[PDB]
Design a protein around this ligand. Structure first.
Ligand SMILES: Cc1ccccc1CC(C)(C)NC[C@H](O)c1ccc(O)c2c1OCC(=O)N2
Length: 457
């Protein structure tokens, strides 16, 4: 029937056109824009390249082979064509695994992120992915390490006009694990913690702020009052014996620290110190009305003062807390600069005052870079957390999971999987290459770049 060909002709061409136009726009956006050249976007460029070569060489010949029902481009070029298809899917999915690891690595340890991931270490990751992708698709095919299972399969290889997909048990499972199952469990476990790490996204901003204002020390340091503290202003014990400071540290940490702890262990002690401090702000009758009127960023600035002076010291600003409850920011910024706390730590009080003025993360450059990547990936609340993380994992799942499951089950029992269903489920995987430009490019700079290249407003 003419209709079904036309239907395939218009649907398959739509997928080709949508994949190409989406990837070309993403590639040309990062190329002709300077603010869009972040190190996080250095990895998404490999995602679009692995997806553009898909829509330019893999998807087009995928539709041409189905419509004509026979290959008409030589057998070597089909071995070449099959190689590109696997090389791109491997380079696409493994890049999706890199994108998830990259954005998680910056959330947990933000300070190290700007120190390790440079231009060299960014290209090495992309180089390693395409090398792993190239060594699992091209070389096993150019060496004929996949075929020769049955007598029937041999005939289609010798014929220069026949080209189907017949692989043995070894390459069918090995390629599926390297391409899909290894990046799957990683992306599943990474986003499982990303959703868990975002459950306290308000405390993480306070942690990175107090690391600049107060200061994190992994080793036990004596305080000015003569007592031993650890991490960020966390008192170990008021006894002047260092032996008691080690035993108290072992109980809260849970191991033999001998004085030295790690970053995440001090960060977990920070969560107990904040929850014990926020309850104190709600406990004090003078700090609760101020806390109810402050926004999220200024609530952290109020807790910043509690970690330095305490609920007794923060309550000592009758004029400032009075204007904070009345939402008078610029007036409260002057009376805070007149107190004794501003005179002893002017560089810290200014950043706290600047936070109370604008309500942004200004004067904390690293923390402001966090809010952009946190909201882009997670969002604000429970309704936004499962939504954004769900569609990023849902699109990657519904496209490639039904194929590789069918691909692996086919090796279990022959003739159990229909060929037409096998092609459709592989084709559903291609559509994921067209969705990625509209999934990972939701950055504010991407929105500015996309609306400018299309002459929008
Ligand atoms: C050539 C032909 C003929 C009929 C139907 C489809 C096709 C195209 C083919 C099968 C080459 N698509 C490759 C498929 O996207 C794919 C991607 C990554 C992989 O790791 C594997 C994989 O195939 C199974 C596997 O074990 N590994």
């Amino acid at each position: 029937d003419e209709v079904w060909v036309v239907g395939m002709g218009i649907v398959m061409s739509l997928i080709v056109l949508a994949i190409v136009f989406g990837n070309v726009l993403v590639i040309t956006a990062i190329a002709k824009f300077e603010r869009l050249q972040t190190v996080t976007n250095y990895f998404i460029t490999s995602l679009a390249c692995a997806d553009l070569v898909m829509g330019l060489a893999v998807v087009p010949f995928g539709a041409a082979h189905i419509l004509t029902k026979t290959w008409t481009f030589g057998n070597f070029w089909c071995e070449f064509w099959t190689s590109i298809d696997v090389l791109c899917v491997t380079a696409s999915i493994e890049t999706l695994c890199v994108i998830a690891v990259d954005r998680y690595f910056a959330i947990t340890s933000p300070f190290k992120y700007q120190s390790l991931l440079t231009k060299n270490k960014a290209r090495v990751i992309i180089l390693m992915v395409w090398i792993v992708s190239g060594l699992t698709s091209f070389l096993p095919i150019q060496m004929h390490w996949y075929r020769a299972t049955h007598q029937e399969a041999i005939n289609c290889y010798a014929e220069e006009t026949c080209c189907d997909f017949f692989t043995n048990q070894a390459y069918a499972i090995a390629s599926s694990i390297v391409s899909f199952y290894v990046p799957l469990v990683i992306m599943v476990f990474v986003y499982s913690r990303v959703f868990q790490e975002c459950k306290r996204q308000l405390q993480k901003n306070i942690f990175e702020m107090l690391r600049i204002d107060e200061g994190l020390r992994l080793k036990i340091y004596k305080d000015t009052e003569g007592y031993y503290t650890i991490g960020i202003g966390h008192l170990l014990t008021k006894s002047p014996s260092l032996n008691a400071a080690k035993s108290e540290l072992d109980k809260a940490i849970g191991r033999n620290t001998n004085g030295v702890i790690t970053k995440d262990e001090a960060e977990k002690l920070f969560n107990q110190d904040v929850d014990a401090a926020v309850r104190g702000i709600l406990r004090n009758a003078k700090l609760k009305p101020v806390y109810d009127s402050l926004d999220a960023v200024r609530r952290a600035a109020l807790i910043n003062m509690v970690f330095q002076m305490g609920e007794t010291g923060v309550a000592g600003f009758t004029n400032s807390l009075r204007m904070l409850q009345q939402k008078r920011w610029d007036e409260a910024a002057v009376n805070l600069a007149k107190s004794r706390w501003y005179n002893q730590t002017p560089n810290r009080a200014k950043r706290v005052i600047t936070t109370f003025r604008t309500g942004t993360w200004d004067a904390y450059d690293i923390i402001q870079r966090m809010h952009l990547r946190q909201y882009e990936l997670c969002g604000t609340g429970e309704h936004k957390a499962l939504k954004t993380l769900g569609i990023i994992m849902g699109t990657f799942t519904l496209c490639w999971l039904p194929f590789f499951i069918v691909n692996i089950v086919h090796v279990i029992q022959d003739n159990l999987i229909r060929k037409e269903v096998y092609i459709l489920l592989n084709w559903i995987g291609y559509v994921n290459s067209g969705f990625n430009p509209l999934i990972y490019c939701r950055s504010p700079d991407f929105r500015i770049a996309f609306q400018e290249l299309l002459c929008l407003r």
